[PDB]
Design an enzyme around this catalytic site. Sequence first.
Site, PDB file in Angstrom:
ATOM      1  N   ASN A 158       6.340  -7.300   7.252  1.00  0.00           N
ATOM      2  CA  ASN A 158       5.117  -6.552   7.522  1.00  0.00           C
ATOM      3  C   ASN A 158       3.909  -7.220   6.877  1.00  0.00           C
ATOM      4  O   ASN A 158       3.827  -7.322   5.653  1.00  0.00           O
ATOM      5  CB  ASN A 158       5.238  -5.105   7.037  1.00  0.00           C
ATOM      6  CG  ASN A 158       3.960  -4.309   7.251  1.00  0.00           C
ATOM      7  OD1 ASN A 158       3.740  -3.741   8.320  1.00  0.00           O
ATOM      8  ND2 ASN A 158       3.111  -4.266   6.230  1.00  0.00           N
ATOM      9  N   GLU A 159       2.980  -7.669   7.716  1.00  0.00           N
ATOM     10  CA  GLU A 159       1.757  -8.337   7.270  1.00  0.00           C
ATOM     11  C   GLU A 159       1.965  -9.465   6.253  1.00  0.00           C
ATOM     12  O   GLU A 159       1.397  -9.422   5.162  1.00  0.00           O
ATOM     13  CB  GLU A 159       0.770  -7.313   6.700  1.00  0.00           C
ATOM     14  CG  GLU A 159       0.318  -6.259   7.694  1.00  0.00           C
ATOM     15  CD  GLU A 159      -0.653  -5.266   7.086  1.00  0.00           C
ATOM     16  OE1 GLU A 159      -0.853  -5.309   5.854  1.00  0.00           O
ATOM     17  OE2 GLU A 159      -1.217  -4.443   7.837  1.00  0.00           O
TER      18      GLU A 159
ATOM     19  N   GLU B 190       0.117  -0.335  13.642  1.00  0.00           N
ATOM     20  CA  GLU B 190      -0.755   0.403  12.732  1.00  0.00           C
ATOM     21  C   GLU B 190      -2.197   0.430  13.217  1.00  0.00           C
ATOM     22  O   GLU B 190      -2.779  -0.610  13.528  1.00  0.00           O
ATOM     23  CB  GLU B 190      -0.721  -0.189  11.323  1.00  0.00           C
ATOM     24  CG  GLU B 190       0.569   0.034  10.559  1.00  0.00           C
ATOM     25  CD  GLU B 190       0.484  -0.472   9.136  1.00  0.00           C
ATOM     26  OE1 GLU B 190      -0.648  -0.632   8.632  1.00  0.00           O
ATOM     27  OE2 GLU B 190       1.546  -0.713   8.524  1.00  0.00           O
TER      28      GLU B 190
ATOM     29  N   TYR C 236     -11.683  -0.820   8.653  1.00  0.00           N
ATOM     30  CA  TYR C 236     -11.776  -1.914   7.690  1.00  0.00           C
ATOM     31  C   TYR C 236     -12.822  -2.931   8.134  1.00  0.00           C
ATOM     32  O   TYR C 236     -13.683  -3.336   7.354  1.00  0.00           O
ATOM     33  CB  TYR C 236     -10.414  -2.587   7.494  1.00  0.00           C
ATOM     34  CG  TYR C 236      -9.456  -1.782   6.643  1.00  0.00           C
ATOM     35  CD1 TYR C 236      -9.892  -1.144   5.490  1.00  0.00           C
ATOM     36  CD2 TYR C 236      -8.119  -1.652   6.997  1.00  0.00           C
ATOM     37  CE1 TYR C 236      -9.023  -0.404   4.709  1.00  0.00           C
ATOM     38  CE2 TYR C 236      -7.241  -0.911   6.223  1.00  0.00           C
ATOM     39  CZ  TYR C 236      -7.701  -0.290   5.080  1.00  0.00           C
ATOM     40  OH  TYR C 236      -6.835   0.447   4.304  1.00  0.00           O
TER      41      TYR C 236
ATOM     42  N   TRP D  97      -1.004   4.809  12.269  1.00  0.00           N
ATOM     43  CA  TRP D  97      -0.801   4.821  10.832  1.00  0.00           C
ATOM     44  C   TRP D  97      -1.703   5.906  10.266  1.00  0.00           C
ATOM     45  O   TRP D  97      -2.925   5.804  10.378  1.00  0.00           O
ATOM     46  CB  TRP D  97      -1.177   3.468  10.227  1.00  0.00           C
ATOM     47  CG  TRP D  97      -0.742   3.317   8.806  1.00  0.00           C
ATOM     48  CD1 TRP D  97      -1.533   3.345   7.695  1.00  0.00           C
ATOM     49  CD2 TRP D  97       0.598   3.125   8.341  1.00  0.00           C
ATOM     50  NE1 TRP D  97      -0.769   3.174   6.565  1.00  0.00           N
ATOM     51  CE2 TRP D  97       0.544   3.039   6.936  1.00  0.00           C
ATOM     52  CE3 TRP D  97       1.838   3.015   8.977  1.00  0.00           C
ATOM     53  CZ2 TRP D  97       1.682   2.849   6.156  1.00  0.00           C
ATOM     54  CZ3 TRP D  97       2.966   2.824   8.202  1.00  0.00           C
ATOM     55  CH2 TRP D  97       2.882   2.744   6.807  1.00  0.00           C
TER      56      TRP D  97
ATOM     57  N   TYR E  20      -7.409  -2.479  12.473  1.00  0.00           N
ATOM     58  CA  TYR E  20      -8.267  -1.409  11.982  1.00  0.00           C
ATOM     59  C   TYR E  20      -9.746  -1.657  12.286  1.00  0.00           C
ATOM     60  O   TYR E  20     -10.606  -1.431  11.432  1.00  0.00           O
ATOM     61  CB  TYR E  20      -8.077  -1.227  10.474  1.00  0.00           C
ATOM     62  CG  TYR E  20      -6.709  -0.723  10.072  1.00  0.00           C
ATOM     63  CD1 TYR E  20      -6.447   0.639   9.984  1.00  0.00           C
ATOM     64  CD2 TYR E  20      -5.682  -1.607   9.772  1.00  0.00           C
ATOM     65  CE1 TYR E  20      -5.201   1.106   9.614  1.00  0.00           C
ATOM     66  CE2 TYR E  20      -4.430  -1.151   9.400  1.00  0.00           C
ATOM     67  CZ  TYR E  20      -4.196   0.207   9.323  1.00  0.00           C
ATOM     68  OH  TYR E  20      -2.954   0.666   8.953  1.00  0.00           O
TER      69      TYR E  20
ATOM     70  N   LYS F 186      -4.531   8.356   5.988  1.00  0.00           N
ATOM     71  CA  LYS F 186      -4.621   7.983   7.395  1.00  0.00           C
ATOM     72  C   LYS F 186      -3.647   8.783   8.253  1.00  0.00           C
ATOM     73  O   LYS F 186      -3.497   8.523   9.446  1.00  0.00           O
ATOM     74  CB  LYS F 186      -4.379   6.482   7.575  1.00  0.00           C
ATOM     75  CG  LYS F 186      -5.467   5.602   6.978  1.00  0.00           C
ATOM     76  CD  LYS F 186      -5.357   4.172   7.483  1.00  0.00           C
ATOM     77  CE  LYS F 186      -6.451   3.289   6.902  1.00  0.00           C
ATOM     78  NZ  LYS F 186      -6.338   3.172   5.423  1.00  0.00           N
TER      79      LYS F 186
ATOM     80  N   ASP G 122       0.809  -1.212   0.000  1.00  0.00           N
ATOM     81  CA  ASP G 122       0.000   0.000   0.000  1.00  0.00           C
ATOM     82  C   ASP G 122       0.848   1.270   0.000  1.00  0.00           C
ATOM     83  O   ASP G 122       0.733   2.107   0.895  1.00  0.00           O
ATOM     84  CB  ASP G 122      -0.958   0.003   1.194  1.00  0.00           C
ATOM     85  CG  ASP G 122      -1.965   1.134   1.128  1.00  0.00           C
ATOM     86  OD1 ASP G 122      -2.396   1.479   0.007  1.00  0.00           O
ATOM     87  OD2 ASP G 122      -2.315   1.682   2.194  1.00  0.00           O
TER      88      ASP G 122
ATOM     89  N   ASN H 295      -1.173  -4.818  13.357  1.00  0.00           N
ATOM     90  CA  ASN H 295      -1.844  -3.793  12.569  1.00  0.00           C
ATOM     91  C   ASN H 295      -3.345  -4.040  12.613  1.00  0.00           C
ATOM     92  O   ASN H 295      -3.851  -4.936  11.937  1.00  0.00           O
ATOM     93  CB  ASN H 295      -1.364  -3.809  11.116  1.00  0.00           C
ATOM     94  CG  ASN H 295       0.103  -3.455  10.976  1.00  0.00           C
ATOM     95  OD1 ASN H 295       0.741  -3.002  11.927  1.00  0.00           O
ATOM     96  ND2 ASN H 295       0.643  -3.642   9.776  1.00  0.00           N
TER      97      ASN H 295
HETATM   98 MG    MG Z   1      -8.302  -1.073  15.938  1.00  0.00          MG
END
Ligand code: MG
Lengths: 587, 587
Positions: free
Chosen positions: A398-399, A492, A459, A537, A455, A556, A162, A453
């Site tokens: 990362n992820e 994040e 998300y 993030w 969201y 963000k 991203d 991370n």
């Molecule tokens: Mg959260």
Amino acid sequence: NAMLYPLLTKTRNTYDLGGIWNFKLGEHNPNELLPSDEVMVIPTSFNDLMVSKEKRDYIGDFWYEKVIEVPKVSEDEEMVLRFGSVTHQAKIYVDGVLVGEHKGGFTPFEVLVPECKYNNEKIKVSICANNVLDYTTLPVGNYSEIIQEDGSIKKKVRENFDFFNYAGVHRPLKLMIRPKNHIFDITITSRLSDDLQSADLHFLVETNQKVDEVRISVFDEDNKLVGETKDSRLFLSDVHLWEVLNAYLYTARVEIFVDNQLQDVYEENFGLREIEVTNGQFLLNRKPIYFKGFGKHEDTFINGRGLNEAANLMDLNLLKDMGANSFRTSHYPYSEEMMRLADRMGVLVIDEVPAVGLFQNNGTWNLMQTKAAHEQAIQELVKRDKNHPSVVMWVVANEPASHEAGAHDYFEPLVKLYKDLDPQKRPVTLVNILMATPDRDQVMDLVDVVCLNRYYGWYVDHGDLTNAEVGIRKELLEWQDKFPDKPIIITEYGADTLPGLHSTWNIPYTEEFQCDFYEMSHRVFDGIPNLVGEQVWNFADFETNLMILRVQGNHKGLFSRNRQPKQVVKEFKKRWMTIPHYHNKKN
Amino acid sequence: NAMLYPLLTKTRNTYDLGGIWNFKLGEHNPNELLPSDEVMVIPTSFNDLMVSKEKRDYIGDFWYEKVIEVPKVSEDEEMVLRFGSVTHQAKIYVDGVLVGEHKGGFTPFEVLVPECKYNNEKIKVSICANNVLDYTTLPVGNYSEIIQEDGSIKKKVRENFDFFNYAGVHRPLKLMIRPKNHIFDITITSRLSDDLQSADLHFLVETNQKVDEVRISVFDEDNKLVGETKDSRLFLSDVHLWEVLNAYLYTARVEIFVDNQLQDVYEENFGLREIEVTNGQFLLNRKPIYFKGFGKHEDTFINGRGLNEAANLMDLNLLKDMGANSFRTSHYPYSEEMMRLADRMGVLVIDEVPAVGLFQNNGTWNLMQTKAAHEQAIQELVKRDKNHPSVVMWVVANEPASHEAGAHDYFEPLVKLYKDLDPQKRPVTLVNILMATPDRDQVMDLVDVVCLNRYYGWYVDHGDLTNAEVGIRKELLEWQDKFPDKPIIITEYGADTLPGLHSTWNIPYTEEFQCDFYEMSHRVFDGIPNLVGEQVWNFADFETNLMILRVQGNHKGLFSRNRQPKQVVKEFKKRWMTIPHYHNKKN
Ligand SMILES: [Mg+2]
Ligand SMILES: [Mg+2]
Ligand SMILES: [Mg+2]
Ligand SMILES: [Mg+2]
């Protein structure tokens, strides 16, 4: 071989080759003279400097070429080209002759200029850069070729990450004159006394040939000599510790002698600080640290991913003012200049290799051919940054698809490589994606710190903060229960926020909702004893590719891309100046 | 002096001293060690790097300091500090000893490092910068002091100009090792043949001591020798002219010899092109030119007035893409890097001294004590930029009080100074303010080209394009009638435009009105035979100080400050690509 930061010393002449270079997107013969029809700056990303989308989206070989005047080089000296980085791949030519290669767009490398040119008036340097990413590169890309029906093949790279695929020579290119018998590498480790007043230093100096004497002089911040040694070991009393947002740096002046005369001299900075991860806590100088900061990006208007030291200092000054204390080099090693700045300002840094995109669209670990690039990235990063007191933790990826079969087998030797190469044995972590929730994840057992991370509310449960709170609190307890002794850090969490967008009804994309999102998140975080860090993030909005979920890049950021604040900045400053850097939530 | 651009040659070791310096806003004793509590980047403006308004608005002495390791310096060599610029004033110190001083924030100067330190391990360089502006400085500011009743003095600079008083070390600082007997200046002139196929080259090489032989080699763009001479004069055949947006540059490699051995070597670029102003036309290579371009500013986010080469190339690429061909260095000399870039890209440049603000908020010329600074500015600018083929015209002042008594006596010797110093004797102009109508103005008789800053429809007849069109046409015809043979160039015309502001009713500050304003302006311009150029204000939005007419800076840019286009950019590209670079409107 070039992990030592370029210096001007009594034995080392360092010249900067930055400026205007002849440029071309496409094919070029290094034996032929690149015309000045198109030019390009070093250092910077070339992309945003292109007016048309077609040239901005170019994938393949692109060339830099310039005739450089040869400086005086003595008999016992050698001349090398030291690149801060070339993104992503590079083949280097001198007078049409290949002299070096490198793969990986965020690590430095040097290239030897042939001795038979040292008496020439000029040398033509050609840089063949390449921005292709695939399943063998870090970061990971989705490479494809289509026939234009015009006879030619057009390349495309659909990023598996991203952020925009900025390319070019992003960091300073140096022409270095140094002795043939020179200092190759310096490693500095220390064991702090039980009262934190003394230190047992060990300087491991690597040479390419041998010398009669390895002398090391240690100076404090008043440039006063405090120690000398010739046996690679030194004891020091009345030490000043490197503290968070209160840095203290010593300088190790390393001199090598042959037949009682100076062969080479270098100065390497270092800080005295202790790091230990134990009992769900991150300990700096034997005190519990609470991480407050940002996931960042080497991203700015115009320059793109190119180095901007002014931006670094502006960003870090904002970081300090808000009461923050740390950041992560997401998702690739940052410039050495940034790392040295972090050392000088006392900012904690989570260091990260470009291991992002290890995720199919499964069978990820039968598809990813990144092992070689991943190993080299770890080798290069540790060798480059091991002396930085600001670096407190390493990141293996990362992820990644850490829930799929073969994941644990992939990361175990890579986590080990970090532990073996790093002389400080600093904690290593893996940044975890939502799809790899506690039960399904099979890699988090390998790391020392759990980095997530998450969201919930953006998300998952988009715009539903009520149900998002239940979801995030639920999973955080699951992580804390699966690894009762491992500290947890949120690396994040955020919400896309466009400046000017407002509402009274907690509407996503508005400035108010960004505040609401973080307020809810913090309410949950403060109830988790093992959660010892929060990194948002992102620090600032940054460029991405074209995706429907992206409204002209990523938004963000707490700050806009021009470093102007959003509404939420005022709120974070209140929270972060209330929470001390040394903060124990075990009580 | 320091007119020559810093180069790396076999006789000249040029090191960059950019990076992180110890910083302090306020008083400092250079005999003492500045701590690292505050740091600052070179090069950049310091202002936008300060988080608080207090430190950003600081006026007075501010210090840069760093301990620098001394490189090898031979017996016949000297070591100098070469500043691209320091804004606005500077005192330079080596180990606490005053060693150099300069006034004027936009011109280069060099400072000799004492020879007694060439064998020292390190030297401490202290830079005492100062951003105070008054009635003796260029640009002009309104200085004042107010006691905070705490016993301290708070300084304030009320700018007499429409741009933010960005300060700091904006341009690269070089540590230069050069021979004591070196080339300190090179002047290159040429007379083009009647068929424009040949050229008579003249070289004036200046050394500080005597030399036995001056050898000059000339190479074309293919780096091929096309001529050589020991007599500082050379005839060339099959020459290639420097053209608008089609540049051709030759290189003059100048070598001085003493006792049959190389003493010093330097390479200076030059272009072959002819300039003449006659019969209400501006002739480039004997063809009528129509100027299309921008008034600019050295201004970006973060860096402020600091050098950004990437920004220079991005802007110039946008300029080229739109069909434009020129810009003006408003309101101060830009970086040498920008000038050299303009040479390479064939962009016409109107070169300008910081003579802005010569206007009391009548009796301007009984209060302005700017004569000495104005003379130095002209001397420094011409000496620095005279070899640039891109430089086609000089500006003696921007919007001075040219309608008041004493104006003519002030500018007559200054216009003369341009003519006397410039070996090419290029046209000089004065950028005229709207208050100085053809009847009132008493200075335009001195210049070769009439440059007008007009805002009919914005400042006068605000939002009334109907009455605006009558007013601008009326005055333009008056200028054409008062000076029948002087070409007219519009150097500023625009309307503040915030991105996102829209309306169907031709509302000022909206993107539509900016289009309407320019559409009306061009309709008028095309009906004036003597009007040979249009340069908009501004290329991009830029920072200013606080005043009610300024909505967070100036928004008259065609592009936003992040170089994103506004609605009008598309309209300009249509017009500027229809009107050729060589466009005769006498027909
Ligand atoms: Mg959260
Ligand atoms: Mg920059
Ligand atoms: Mg007008
Ligand atoms: Mg016309």
